[PDB]
């Protein structure tokens, strides 16, 4: 199998209801104060291989 063909989502603060699909492939940023006090930082891509 491919080395990087499967990725797990390192995401939080959105505890999902049972049997919920989480396909919002978005770079997790906030653009507000609770991320280094600026926009564009702490923009961690949730998926990790």
């Amino acid at each position: 199998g491919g080395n990087y063909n499967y990725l797990y989502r390192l995401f939080r603060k959105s505890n999902l209801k049972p049997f919920e699909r989480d396909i919002s492939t978005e770079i997790y940023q906030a653009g507000s104060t609770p991320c280094n006090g600026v926009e564009g930082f702490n923009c961690y891509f949730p998926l990790q291989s």
Partner: protein, 49 residues
């Protein structure tokens, strides 16, 4: 700060310290924590640190 082979110790207790005021600080190269959500550090009590 001393050398890596002679690093410095400190024991701390009987404190009421806010960690939220430190997490939002951007003066750090990296702040990543293991197994414990930093956002919840204000809702936990510990014997000592």
């Amino acid at each position: 700060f001393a050398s890596v082979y002679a690093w410095n110790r400190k024991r701390i207790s009987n404190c009421v310290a806010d960690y939220s005021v430190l997490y939002n600080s951007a003066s750090f190269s990296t702040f990543k924590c293991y197994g414990v959500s930093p956002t919840k550090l204000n809702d936990l009590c510990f014997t000592n640190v």
